[PDB]
Write an enzyme that holds these catalytic residues in place. Structure first.
Site, short mmCIF file in Angstrom:
data_model
loop_
_atom_site.label_atom_id
_atom_site.label_comp_id
_atom_site.label_asym_id
_atom_site.label_seq_id
_atom_site.Cartn_x
_atom_site.Cartn_y
_atom_site.Cartn_z
N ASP A 193 0.80 -1.22 0.00
CA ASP A 193 0.00 0.00 0.00
C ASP A 193 0.84 1.28 0.00
O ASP A 193 1.91 1.36 0.62
CB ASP A 193 -0.88 -0.08 1.26
CG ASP A 193 -1.84 1.10 1.39
OD1 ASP A 193 -2.77 1.10 0.58
OD2 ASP A 193 -1.63 1.96 2.26
N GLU A 219 1.06 -0.44 -5.22
CA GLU A 219 0.08 0.53 -5.64
C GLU A 219 0.78 1.90 -5.62
O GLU A 219 0.99 2.47 -4.53
CB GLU A 219 -1.18 0.67 -4.77
CG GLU A 219 -2.29 1.55 -5.29
CD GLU A 219 -3.23 2.29 -4.43
OE1 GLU A 219 -2.68 2.90 -3.45
OE2 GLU A 219 -4.47 2.32 -4.68
O1 LIG Z 1 -3.11 10.77 11.60
C1 LIG Z 1 -2.96 10.83 10.16
C2 LIG Z 1 -4.13 11.51 9.52
O2 LIG Z 1 -5.29 10.99 10.19
C3 LIG Z 1 -6.54 11.49 9.80
O3 LIG Z 1 -6.85 11.06 8.48
C4 LIG Z 1 -8.02 10.28 8.24
C5 LIG Z 1 -8.68 10.74 6.95
O4 LIG Z 1 -9.25 12.05 7.00
C6 LIG Z 1 -9.81 9.80 6.57
O5 LIG Z 1 -10.38 10.24 5.33
C7 LIG Z 1 -9.27 8.41 6.45
O6 LIG Z 1 -8.45 8.03 5.38
C8 LIG Z 1 -8.59 6.84 4.71
C9 LIG Z 1 -8.95 7.15 3.26
O7 LIG Z 1 -10.25 7.74 3.27
C10 LIG Z 1 -8.98 5.93 2.42
O8 LIG Z 1 -8.87 6.26 1.02
C11 LIG Z 1 -7.89 4.98 2.70
O9 LIG Z 1 -6.84 5.32 1.81
C12 LIG Z 1 -5.89 4.27 1.59
C13 LIG Z 1 -6.31 3.35 0.47
O10 LIG Z 1 -7.21 2.27 0.81
C14 LIG Z 1 -5.10 2.67 -0.19
O11 LIG Z 1 -5.52 1.73 -1.17
C15 LIG Z 1 -4.10 3.71 -0.58
O12 LIG Z 1 -4.48 4.74 -1.43
O13 LIG Z 1 -3.62 4.29 0.67
C16 LIG Z 1 -4.55 4.98 1.47
C17 LIG Z 1 -3.91 5.07 2.86
O14 LIG Z 1 -3.45 3.75 3.17
O15 LIG Z 1 -7.61 4.76 4.07
C18 LIG Z 1 -7.36 5.96 4.83
C19 LIG Z 1 -7.03 5.51 6.23
O16 LIG Z 1 -8.11 4.74 6.78
O17 LIG Z 1 -8.56 8.00 7.63
C20 LIG Z 1 -7.53 8.81 8.13
C21 LIG Z 1 -7.09 8.32 9.49
O18 LIG Z 1 -8.19 7.82 10.26
C22 LIG Z 1 -6.57 13.00 9.85
O19 LIG Z 1 -7.80 13.43 9.29
C23 LIG Z 1 -5.39 13.65 9.16
O20 LIG Z 1 -5.30 15.04 9.39
C24 LIG Z 1 -4.08 13.04 9.71
O21 LIG Z 1 -2.90 13.55 9.14
#
Ligand SMILES: OC[C@H]1O[C@H](O[C@H]2[C@H](O)[C@@H](O)[C@@H](O[C@H]3[C@H](O)[C@@H](O)[C@@H](O[C@H]4[C@H](O)[C@@H](O)[C@@H](O)O[C@@H]4CO)O[C@@H]3CO)O[C@@H]2CO)[C@H](O)[C@@H](O)[C@@H]1O
Ligand SMILES: [Ca+2]
Ligand SMILES: [Ca+2]
Length: 418
Positions: A193, A219
């Site tokens: 990831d 990815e």
């Molecule tokens: O502490 C770090 C940050 O934490 C907080 O972030 C939140 C986001 O606002 C949420 O939107 C969410 O993020 C998801 C995201 O929505 C989702 O796309 C997913 O992204 C993955 C994806 O599956 C993958 O295939 C690839 O693209 O990588 C991405 C990351 O691995 O997963 C995210 C995480 O669950 O969650 C986070 C954390 O709960 C906060 O808002 C930020 O300010 C902060 O920096």
């Protein structure tokens, strides 16, 4: 199931895999704690459908949560806090049962791994790395979304949960979990990831150490305009960007060049993804998909994520193309098991296997018709694919005796074999 490394030593495992993405984004909400049970029970069905591998969800427990308006999410695995397998997809015991069932049915188990960051703030966790030791990105001065001294890749949003994956101790920690996954949870490989977040070379390192002969895919979702102006990538094609990552990590890479063309160009332009590349060293490392858990829809709440979803009118054509061409195809759980594209996909899997089409098979595009017309040189048979085309007969573009293999959507999808 053929198993080597490519001619450039990329971990494509024979280049004959057909992968099922084993989940959708709302699984933890729709089948809470039951996903591993569902997979254990579907194992024979998946094996019978023709998949050689399954991309499992992140095994590391995720009890995160968030909301921004109407949007809510958490627990899907991308913001894990521990390596403990008793998370929202099911228990450790169910996981083992599921991996056992899959592997026994002949499907290799690929785990999704998230090394870039972790749920730092989670109160109850088994992994606690303190500040000031260089375990975190933010342990260093963090200008913006660019490599700093505590992280040699991009950051995840704010960068406060970003790990220094290059710290001897963090590297070591991932390495050991990869090995654990291979030795007790039957891993056949990994799906890495957010590869933009750390060095490609580290992926080769982790692979070399833990599952050198396994399958891997990274990815890398980052367009030219995301790089600095002085970077050669700021002006490169999506193809060169993903190819460069693959040369360094020594792992196949998701074909985001084909995905962007699917989304922004016409069907005829599909020929510009990495998998249509005339050089086999280029096309053989492509890992093609139509949608994933982020880009496509998901059953349930908010229709899931849908960040870059392919319109339903091109789903059949999209699958016809990836199942019949070079690179390694991935089928989305949903299209296969929720939305009724199943029968159609089964036919194509069978077509691909009969023709002996592989990662490095040759593909030629024919310019004189509308839509996309291609000739694929499978090792057993040649296929003629005409999508949204005026082509009349396979013989207009290829020599040989052809029989009709697939004819769907009022001829918008036609495949012939020699
Ligand atoms: O502490 C770090 C940050 O934490 C907080 O972030 C939140 C986001 O606002 C949420 O939107 C969410 O993020 C998801 C995201 O929505 C989702 O796309 C997913 O992204 C993955 C994806 O599956 C993958 O295939 C690839 O693209 O990588 C991405 C990351 O691995 O997963 C995210 C995480 O669950 O969650 C986070 C954390 O709960 C906060 O808002 C930020 O300010 C902060 O920096
Ligand atoms: Ca193989
Ligand atoms: Ca990072």
């Amino acid at each position: 199931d053929q198993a080597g490394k490519s001619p450039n030593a990329v971990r494509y495992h024979g280049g004959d895999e057909i992968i099922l993405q084993g989940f959708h984004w709302n699984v933890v909400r729709e089948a809470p704690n039951d996903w591993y049970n569902i997979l254990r029970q579907q194992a024979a069905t998946i094996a019978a459908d023709g998949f050689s591998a399954i991309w499992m969800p992140v095994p590391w427990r995720d009890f995160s949560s968030w909301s921004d308006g109407s949007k809510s999410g958490g627990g899907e695995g991308y913001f894990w806090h521990d390596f403990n397998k008793n998370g929202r997809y099911g228990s450790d015991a169910q996981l083992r049962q599921a991996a056992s069932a899959l592997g026994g049915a002949g499907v290799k188990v690929l785990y999704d791994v998230v090394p870039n960051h972790m749920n730092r703030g989670y109160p109850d966790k088994e992994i606690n790395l303190p500040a000031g030791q260089g375990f975190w990105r933010n342990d260093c001065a963090d200008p913006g979304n660019y490599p700093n001294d505590c992280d040699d890749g991009d950051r995840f949003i704010g960068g406060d949960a970003d790990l220094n994956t290059g710290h001897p101790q963090v590297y070591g920690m991932f390495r050991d979990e990869f090995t654990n996954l291979r030795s007790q949870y039957g891993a056949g490989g990994f799906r890495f990831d957010f590869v933009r977040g750390y060095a490609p070379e580290r992926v080769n390192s982790w692979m070399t150490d833990s599952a050198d002969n396994s399958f891997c895919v990274g990815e890398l979702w980052k367009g030219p305009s995301e790089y600095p102006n002085w970077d050669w990538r700021n002006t490169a094609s999506w193809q060169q960007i993903i190819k460069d990552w693959s040369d360094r990590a020594k792992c196949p890479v998701f074909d985001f060049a084909l995905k962007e063309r699917m989304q922004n160009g016409s069907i005829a332009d599909w020929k510009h993804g990495l998998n249509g590349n005339p050089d086999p060293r280029w096309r053989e490392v492509a890992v093609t998909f139509v949608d994933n858990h982020n880009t496509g829809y998901s059953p349930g709440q908010n229709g899931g994520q849908h960040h870059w979803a392919l319109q339903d009118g091109l789903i059949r054509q999209a699958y016809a193309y990836i199942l019949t061409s070079p690179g390694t195809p991935v089928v989305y759980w949903d299209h296969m098991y929720d939305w009724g594209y199943g029968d159609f996909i089964r036919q194509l899997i069978q077509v691909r296997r009969a023709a002996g089409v592989r990662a490095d098979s040759a593909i030629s595009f024919h310019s004189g018709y509308s839509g996309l017309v291609a000739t694929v040189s499978g090792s057993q048979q040649t296929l003629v694919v005409a999508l949204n085309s005026d082509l009349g007969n396979p013989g207009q573009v290829a020599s040989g005796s052809f029989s009709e293999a697939v004819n769907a959507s009022n001829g918008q999808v036609r495949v012939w074999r020699s």
